[PDB]
């Protein structure tokens, strides 16, 4: 096999050979397509065999890296990009079995002083393509581990220092570059240099607020998310933003060159109509917003009567609706045609670009050979330092920076003295949604073990300025040992204000909290304490912890631990469906069934002073709590709660004739009727329990079952199919009772006559 | 498909009808009413396995094809929505490519005894809140005791409280549509033509 | 032509006399289709030759007026309405020429001590179709205008007390009833009679108050005007509203009777099903609103198991998105499968009430003749009770009552003593849109002349209960003696706030006011006084009137008239476009041009520190008022106005090299040059006039065009638009200066070569 | 079609490019600097009509087939719209009806002359309120003479300052690509087969 391996080790060497000779004899002149084919084979060639045996082309990589990284810099993308692959097989796909990996590493990184790294990364991990951007991410994460510690703090801070203000202007193409940077400075920078970048961010941080705050993004941004069009479309009779919308015969003569300048001189008038258009749409999205009327004209200025008639030909609308859609279709047709006039000014923009890289080649390029990269002119072309998406993902970027850094005592120093950082963190944060996730993740770390952070957080949100979302996400983690605090603060706040997002907010926090316990043994859980209500109304007045309770501070409001009741019939079907699946993981707790039970018999009688439609989360969860058991059954029927439903039953039935002639009552008394009468049958129906149950408790039903199946089935024209469905379990009780027991069933109907 | 997702998910409906040393009472149970009025109505191994479940506890461990207006089994049936704020649209994820190496939102390190310790403390102050709802507050003398708690909790609403002579149900009044009659059919027509020339 | 005559006379009265006989005829035994038809054609033969001669029929209606009025009330649909237009025929087309109407129309009011036109209007006035209420109001109109005043106050007071009551759950089809008796109210009721009827719609204001305050609409409605699927569907899975939505054999033997019940049971179980899916796609609904998540499932209670299948065919959406429909079309594709589901659910409860009808009829009407009226059971089915359009509409009855009402002194003092009447009423109208205009117009009644109540609601809009839009409305109307105020405290909020909405409403109050001037003579307009800043600052800071400004109860802000200026520049192109129309407007006032040439050139310095996005609309002004005539164009150039165009030019071109190479900033230059460019050149071109200004201007301005044209053509590859026109327009200025004067231009080279 | 409205309305388009006793001066133009220069570049006929103009007040009285790119006349064009704000659907128009007889908002009834003093005095009101905002306030000593009334509003301007001694313009920098060689091949080659075994 050695002979084979030898072979090999030849092979690839003359295929290195090829590849540098046809490499310089193509630079030497000015190549075409055939130029550099052979060059594609070659490297398709010697990267099959490349896989073959990683060990032997790692070897010969790190023998000749210099060849190899001047290829990648300056060739076309073609060949770069597979030079770069290879080297990545070559560094990744080595066992690391001795050092070896480790000198290439370190013969990359210090390679002519590093130049040739320092053109890749400018070129390829900040580039338009994102492919070749999580390429070198994920070369250059295997380099920083496999280098040298000196090495390592080189790469770093040049990745830093000198590539990251270049990237400061493209929204998205910095997001790698700021993920390494971010991952790696925390433990090869200094302190000094962490307080230092620390700095620089919070200073980016002021500028990009500055700016929003100045050109008037708040405005257009309610605008545009009050009509639907989304945050995505704030300028869009704007030159377009490169970064965020990603989308002429070869001159010889100079007739052909007249051409292309004529060319270029009617494109130039047909994006200024195409702008023009947009302008228009603009202002009509603008009308549809404000509502004041009979406002003015607005004017544009037009180079021909193009625009005038295609406003005529379609300006128009339909006021014919079919409901719902009134709003929604006539929003759908705008958003297609300023879709469509978007679409048109991006294909203008590249026909442009072309049509000008075409002339510059021609004027001076004529001579320069293909097989060099040709750089695009990108940077003038592309208003990215006036978009709103790029300007929230360089303040991500910021944030990300920040939160980074924050592990280092001096730098978190830093961000907490700093000029009212917070606030105006947590503001962007509420005027933005766009920011309002990392931004608050930020904040939660600011918020950790801390206390007077949390104070002032806390008086933040009473003001107004934070939300109070921000604290339930504080709630999320563990290990914090502040969650007490702001718990008091959730729970003041769904206590007193009573808004939907509030109580919504607290009862999935209480949710998650009960159901967190199934993670730990029925010995611990088994440990719950039955403290008086006095304890809890000491802990939410006063400021002690909970193993201490047991000045009022904090006053409570008119009777306070309703609130959590009054979830259980919310008009919001959200916050009736938290608070009923609170109930139901209360009723699965340990010794806290009696409760639950106490909960449901108490509100119980809410069904008659509450429309039926908000009752329904209720009915469902008492279902499901009698039903957890069959225990539960015998022990509830013992308690004559069978006698309470057949009690309200017959309550229920006997003030039918009071209530109004209409649908509505009708389906309201269906409605309480089918759950009274489901109850009663989940109650008296099952195994052998049950049966024995409804056995011992015939003597006390009977009656009222015949009576109100007589007068459900007395019902003709007033029928429901709640009132068919409590009628038809009705008579399935009234059978089962009386198959064995016919006597009874006789001297009751012998009473009743 | 990768471009469309489920929003609204359906889950496992539950129905609604269900398909059809020694334990001596204790002082209290013998003075109650009701338990001696069970007993004269069912005989004595039917009041043993009553009392036996009253003082034990469970051992806890495409296409359309069904018409609208076809019979089957009532239930509850719960929908569990996977969707996305409108005003948070193309929010919320710039971070969530799985490629990222900078530490994202990930749960602090933390032992047994601690995560354990914090986990039932969090739960004691949910369950205190929840408890303290209640408009009668609920005395336990004895936890442990299913049936004394349940008494315990349960026994000053009175559910027992039978309803008063009960009298027939008063029918209530159908819809009827009789088209009004004209009085004058249904017990002098004058000549137009004779006069006005 | 009498023989004709009079046989047309014996013709209606044979031709009446056989409709009266085959009526009883047919009334005596049970009819069929056959029995109506020749009834049918004998209505529409009299119907032929009625109109031939009016006034004869109407002397042979009013001989037998009872047993027309007998007919109309008591047959079905099709005979009545014929009957009742022939009514009409005869009351209003006659000429009045003696008192023949009148006798007719008493006759009709007083016919069986009103019974029988007590029927008609409660089934025809306030009945389902839409038609035969508008043909109800027409013949009310006529009957009221031609009777005497006791039958016009019989009418009226039966209206009122009798008719309305029945109307009250009837959203729509009560509007031409309210209508009615608002026109003839105050003419025909006494002041006692008219302050009950103030305090009885009051009364009815204060439930339907409250009623919206406590079934939760505020909340649900936000969350359907958030969503955009409008106010109409407030709450779509309730039992469709027949008056908002419009829209079997027949039983012999007892089998088909037994076949009806068992469809009648198939169908509600099928109704139920449709509700319970409307139920999940409104909880879908509020689960696009709330912003929290992971909120928890909802759980809906099915009678089988076609929702589970339905909701997992269907409850799919699309994570691809077009931009910018994003957001569009899937609430337009929710709207879809919500309107589909609704429609099937009204077309139910429609084949539910046909089925029950039947099942009726087969039971009890068998027997019954079919020329009498069929009622059919709506109030029963109607659910609009709990509606919201059908409570904004008997809100909007009652509003339009007061309005009727308030020309009573005793009924306007009733109004204003109300228990904080005008403040629920301006909340009213802030919360709901659809009760906003209509509310606004009774203040703006009740904030006439009166000084008191013009200060409440001053002080209401200050504490921020009543929108500023009402005193707008106000100020819409003339002869209000008391407008000064309201103008003031508009005023004043838009010095203050700064806010779009009110900067827009006050710019077009002045544009209005200012425009209003074209219709009276030119000596009155040139007595306009020209009165100096003291004034007017006199007017806004106190409280005294206009003509008397020639302590400081109101202090004004930091320097306060610059407000219309920044208008001039603001972000919301509809405030740039109103207060550039308020500066044309202004310069077309008497003695008025040099203010705005003032204000014009006071401004021009902008154009450096703005955007020029935000300046077209101040260069389109410019462009007007320069162009106002050729007078204004020769009085601006002995001013020098050319020089200073010259030298904006000449710093403009100056100073590109030091501005950043980015497509943007071109634009920017491109757009300022060419608006200066277009000014000189239409300050120095059209007539005779102007070729002498530029005759005599070519000194000063020579050498600059002639370098400026060079400096323009310089540029290739940063070429706009705009600065090829501003090249074209410069160089068509040069080569007409130097037509003629070709040594000047020699002169000129030798000297900058 | 009536169904269909025209929320957008284009108005005519205003052209940018226009086709192309005695009356004897005041004591204040005649030691006018600039009118002397003027004097001595044009002859006294066009100084005549030139004064003539100053002093005199003017007597005030589908389917679309044009291309995009096409040459044409530029201008400013106004566009209008009657359209209806989305919050507003369904509003406003309950008794838009002409039917109803009931008194809708109609206009006040005056008298020509309490009309005519109105208008005056609201107008006076805006225009003063207008004329307030102006930086530098105007002080009109004859506001009948166009020309005097225009010289004291905007003669503190100084709006004849010359521009100073002018200098060649800088050409602004153009837009280059030239990609960049290879040094090493715009100015010794390993052999890779030799060692390595
Ligand atoms: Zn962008
Ligand atoms: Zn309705």
Same mark, same amino acid.
């Given at each position: 096999?050695?002979?084979?391996?030898?072979?090999?080790?030849?092979?690839?060497?003359?295929?290195?050979?090829?590849?540098?000779?046809?490499?310089?004899?193509?630079?030497?002149?000015?190549?075409?397509?055939?130029?550099?084919?052979?060059?594609?084979?070659?490297?398709?060639?010697?990267?099959?065999?490349?896989?073959?045996?990683?060990?032997?082309?790692?070897?010969?990589?790190?023998?000749?890296?210099?060849?190899?990284?001047?290829?990648?810099?300056?060739?076309?993308?073609?060949?770069?990009?597979?030079?770069?692959?290879?080297?990545?097989?070559?560094?990744?796909?080595?066992?690391?079995?001795?050092?070896?990996?480790?000198?290439?590493?370190?013969?990359?990184?210090?390679?002519?002083?590093?130049?040739?790294?320092?053109?890749?990364?400018?070129?390829?991990?900040?580039?338009?393509?994102?492919?070749?951007?999580?390429?070198?991410?994920?070369?250059?994460?295997?380099?920083?581990?496999?280098?040298?510690?000196?090495?390592?703090?080189?790469?770093?801070?040049?990745?830093?220092?000198?590539?990251?203000?270049?990237?400061?202007?493209?929204?998205?193409?910095?997001?790698?570059?700021?993920?390494?940077?971010?991952?790696?400075?925390?433990?090869?920078?200094?302190?000094?240099?962490?307080?230092?970048?620390?700095?620089?961010?919070?200073?980016?941080?002021?500028?990009?607020?500055?700016?929003?705050?100045?050109?008037?993004?708040?405005?257009?941004?309610?605008?545009?998310?009050?009509?639907?069009?989304?945050?995505?479309?704030?300028?869009?009779?704007?030159?377009?933003?490169?970064?965020?919308?990603?989308?002429?015969?070869?001159?010889?003569?100079?007739?052909?060159?007249?051409?292309?300048?004529?060319?270029?001189?009617?494109?130039?008038?047909?994006?200024?109509?195409?702008?023009?258009?947009?302008?228009?749409?603009?202002?009509?999205?603008?009308?549809?917003?404000?509502?004041?009327?009979?406002?003015?004209?607005?004017?544009?200025?037009?180079?021909?009567?193009?625009?005038?008639?295609?406003?005529?030909?379609?300006?128009?609308?339909?006021?014919?609706?079919?409901?719902?859609?009134?709003?929604?279709?006539?929003?759908?047709?705008?958003?297609?045609?300023?879709?469509?006039?978007?679409?048109?000014?991006?294909?203008?923009?590249?026909?442009?670009?072309?049509?000008?890289?075409?002339?510059?080649?021609?004027?001076?390029?004529?001579?320069?050979?293909?097989?060099?990269?040709?750089?695009?002119?990108?940077?003038?072309?592309?208003?990215?330092?006036?978009?709103?998406?790029?300007?929230?993902?360089?303040?991500?970027?910021?944030?990300?920076?920040?939160?980074?850094?924050?592990?280092?005592?001096?730098?978190?120093?830093?961000?907490?003295?700093?000029?009212?950082?917070?606030?105006?963190?947590?503001?962007?944060?509420?005027?933005?949604?766009?920011?309002?996730?990392?931004?608050?993740?930020?904040?939660?770390?600011?918020?950790?073990?801390?206390?007077?952070?949390?104070?002032?957080?806390?008086?933040?949100?009473?003001?107004?300025?934070?939300?109070?979302?921000?604290?339930?996400?504080?709630?999320?983690?563990?290990?914090?040992?502040?969650?007490?605090?702001?718990?008091?603060?959730?729970?003041?706040?769904?206590?007193?204000?009573?808004?939907?997002?509030?109580?919504?907010?607290?009862?999935?926090?209480?949710?998650?909290?009960?159901?967190?316990?199934?993670?730990?043994?029925?010995?611990?859980?088994?440990?719950?304490?039955?403290?008086?209500?006095?304890?809890?109304?000491?802990?939410?007045?006063?400021?002690?912890?909970?193993?201490?309770?047991?000045?009022?501070?904090?006053?409570?409001?008119?009777?306070?631990?309703?609130?959590?009741?009054?979830?259980?019939?919310?008009?919001?079907?959200?916050?009736?469906?938290?608070?009923?699946?609170?109930?139901?993981?209360?009723?699965?707790?340990?010794?806290?069934?009696?409760?639950?039970?106490?909960?449901?018999?108490?509100?119980?009688?809410?069904?008659?002073?509450?429309?039926?439609?908000?009752?329904?989360?209720?009915?469902?969860?008492?279902?499901?709590?009698?039903?957890?058991?069959?225990?539960?059954?015998?022990?509830?029927?013992?308690?004559?709660?069978?006698?309470?439903?057949?009690?309200?039953?017959?309550?229920?039935?006997?003030?039918?004739?009071?209530?109004?002639?209409?649908?509505?009552?009708?389906?309201?008394?269906?409605?309480?009727?089918?759950?009274?009468?489901?109850?009663?049958?989940?109650?008296?129906?099952?195994?052998?329990?049950?049966?024995?149950?409804?056995?011992?408790?015939?003597?006390?039903?009977?009656?009222?079952?015949?009576?109100?199946?007589?007068?459900?089935?007395?019902?003709?024209?007033?029928?429901?199919?709640?009132?068919?469905?409590?009628?038809?379990?009705?008579?399935?009780?009234?059978?089962?009772?009386?198959?064995?027991?016919?006597?009874?069933?006789?001297?009751?109907?012998?009473?009743?006559? | 498909?990768?471009?469309?997702?489920?929003?609204?998910?359906?889950?496992?409906?539950?129905?609604?009808?269900?398909?059809?040393?020694?334990?001596?009472?204790? *002082?209290?149970? &013998?003075?109650?009413?009701?338990? $001696?009025?069970?007993? @004269?109505?069912? /005989?004595?191994?039917?009041? +043993?396995?009553?009392? *036996?479940?009253? &003082?034990?506890?469970?051992?806890? $461990?495409?296409?359309? @094809?069904?018409? /609208?207006?076809?019979?089957? +089994?009532?239930?509850?049936?719960?929908?569990?929505?996977?969707?996305?704020?409108?005003?948070?649209?193309?929010?919320?994820?710039?971070?969530?490519?799985?490629?990222?190496?900078?530490?994202?939102?990930?749960?602090?390190?933390?032992?047994?005894?601690?995560?354990?310790?914090?986990?039932?403390?969090?739960?004691?102050?949910?369950?205190?809140?929840?408890?303290?709802?209640?408009?009668?507050?609920?005395?336990?003398?004895?936890?442990?005791?299913?049936?004394?708690?349940?008494?315990?909790?349960?026994?000053?609403?009175?559910?027992?409280?039978?309803?008063?002579?009960?009298?027939?149900?008063?029918?209530?009044?159908?819809?009827?549509?009789?088209?009004?009659?004209?009085?004058?059919?249904?017990?002098?027509?004058?000549?137009?033509?004779?006069?006005?020339?």
């Amino acid at each position: 096999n050695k002979y084979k391996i030898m072979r090999d080790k030849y092979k690839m060497q003359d295929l290195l050979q090829q590849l540098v000779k046809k490499y310089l004899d193509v630079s030497k002149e000015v190549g075409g397509h055939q130029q550099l084919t052979e060059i594609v084979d070659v490297l398709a060639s010697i990267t099959k065999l490349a896989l073959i045996r990683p060990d032997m082309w790692r070897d010969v990589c790190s023998t000749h890296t210099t060849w190899l990284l001047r290829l990648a810099c300056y060739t076309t993308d073609v060949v770069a990009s597979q030079v770069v692959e290879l080297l990545i097989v070559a560094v990744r796909d080595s066992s690391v079995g001795g050092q070896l990996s480790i000198q290439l590493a370190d013969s990359i990184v210090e390679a002519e002083n590093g130049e040739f790294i320092e053109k890749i990364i400018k070129r390829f991990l900040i580039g338009r393509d994102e492919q070749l951007r999580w390429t070198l991410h994920g070369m250059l994460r295997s380099v920083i581990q496999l280098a040298s510690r000196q090495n390592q703090c080189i790469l770093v801070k040049k990745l830093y220092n000198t590539i990251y203000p270049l990237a400061a202007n493209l929204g998205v193409q910095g997001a790698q570059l700021v993920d390494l940077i971010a991952t790696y400075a925390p433990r090869v920078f200094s302190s000094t240099e962490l307080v230092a970048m620390t700095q620089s961010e919070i200073s980016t941080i002021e500028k990009i607020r500055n700016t929003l705050n100045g050109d008037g993004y708040q405005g257009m941004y309610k605008l545009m998310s009050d009509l639907g069009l989304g945050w995505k479309s704030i300028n869009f009779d704007r030159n377009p933003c490169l970064v965020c919308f990603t989308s002429a015969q070869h001159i010889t003569c100079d007739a052909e060159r007249g051409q292309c300048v004529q060319e270029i001189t009617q494109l130039l008038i047909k994006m200024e109509t195409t702008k023009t258009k947009l302008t228009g749409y603009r202002a009509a999205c603008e009308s549809l917003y404000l509502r004041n009327r009979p406002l003015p004209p607005y004017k544009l200025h037009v180079e021909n009567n193009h625009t005038s008639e295609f406003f005529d030909a379609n300006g128009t609308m339909n006021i014919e609706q079919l409901p719902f859609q009134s709003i929604t279709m006539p929003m759908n047709n705008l958003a297609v045609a300023i879709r469509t006039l978007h679409s048109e000014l991006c294909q203008q923009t590249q026909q442009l670009m072309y049509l000008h890289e075409e002339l510059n080649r021609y004027d001076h390029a004529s001579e320069v050979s293909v097989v060099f990269h040709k750089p695009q002119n990108i940077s003038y072309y592309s208003t990215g330092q006036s978009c709103f998406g790029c300007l929230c993902n360089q303040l991500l970027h910021s944030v990300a920076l920040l939160h980074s850094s924050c592990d280092d005592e001096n730098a978190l120093n830093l961000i907490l003295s700093s000029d009212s950082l917070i606030e105006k963190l947590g503001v962007l944060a509420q005027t933005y949604e766009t920011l309002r996730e990392e931004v608050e993740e930020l904040l939660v770390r600011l918020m950790f073990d801390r206390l007077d952070v949390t104070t002032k957080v806390e008086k933040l949100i009473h003001t107004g300025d934070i939300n109070l979302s921000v604290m339930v996400k504080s709630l999320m983690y563990a290990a914090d040992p502040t969650w007490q605090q702001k718990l008091k603060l959730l729970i003041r706040l769904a206590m007193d204000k009573r808004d939907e997002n509030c109580c919504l907010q607290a009862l999935m926090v209480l949710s998650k909290y009960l159901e967190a316990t199934k993670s730990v043994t029925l010995d611990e859980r088994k440990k719950i304490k039955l403290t008086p209500n006095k304890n809890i109304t000491k802990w939410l007045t006063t400021d002690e912890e909970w193993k201490d309770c047991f000045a009022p501070t904090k006053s409570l409001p008119s009777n306070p631990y309703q609130w959590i009741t009054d979830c259980l019939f919310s008009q919001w079907m959200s916050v009736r469906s938290a608070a009923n699946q609170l109930l139901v993981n209360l009723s699965r707790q340990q010794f806290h069934e009696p409760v639950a039970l106490l909960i449901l018999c108490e509100n119980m009688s809410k069904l008659s002073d509450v429309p039926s439609s908000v009752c329904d989360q209720f009915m469902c969860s008492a279902h499901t709590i009698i039903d957890s058991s069959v225990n539960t059954k015998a022990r509830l029927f013992v308690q004559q709660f069978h006698v309470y439903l057949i009690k309200r039953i017959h309550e229920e039935c006997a003030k039918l004739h009071e209530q109004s002639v209409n649908l509505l009552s009708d389906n309201m008394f269906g409605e309480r009727l089918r759950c009274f009468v489901e109850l009663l049958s989940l109650l008296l129906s099952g195994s052998n329990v049950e049966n024995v149950l409804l056995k011992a408790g015939a003597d006390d039903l009977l009656i009222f079952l015949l009576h109100s199946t007589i007068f459900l089935k007395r019902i003709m024209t007033r029928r429901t199919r709640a009132t068919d469905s409590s009628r038809i379990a009705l008579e399935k009780l009234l059978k089962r009772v009386s198959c064995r027991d016919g006597t009874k069933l006789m001297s009751v109907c012998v009473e009743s006559l | 498909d990768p471009n469309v997702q489920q929003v609204i998910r359906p889950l496992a409906t539950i129905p609604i009808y269900p398909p059809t040393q020694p334990i001596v009472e204790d *002082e209290a149970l &013998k003075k109650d009413e009701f338990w $001696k009025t069970l007993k @004269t109505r069912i /005989s004595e191994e039917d009041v +043993d396995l009553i009392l *036996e479940t009253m &003082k034990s506890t469970a051992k806890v $461990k495409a296409q359309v @094809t069904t018409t /609208s207006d076809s019979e089957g +089994d009532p239930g509850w049936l719960p929908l569990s929505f996977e969707t996305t704020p409108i005003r948070s649209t193309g929010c919320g994820g710039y971070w969530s490519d799985k490629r990222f190496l900078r530490p994202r939102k990930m749960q602090r390190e933390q032992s047994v005894a601690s995560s354990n310790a914090e986990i039932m403390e969090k739960a004691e102050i949910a369950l205190a809140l929840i408890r303290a709802s209640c408009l009668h507050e609920p005395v336990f003398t004895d936890p442990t005791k299913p049936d004394i708690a349940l008494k315990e909790a349960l026994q000053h609403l009175r559910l027992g409280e039978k309803p008063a002579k009960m009298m027939e149900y008063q029918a209530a009044e159908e819809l009827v549509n009789m088209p009004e009659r004209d009085p004058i059919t249904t017990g002098e027509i004058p000549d137009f033509t004779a006069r006005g020339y």
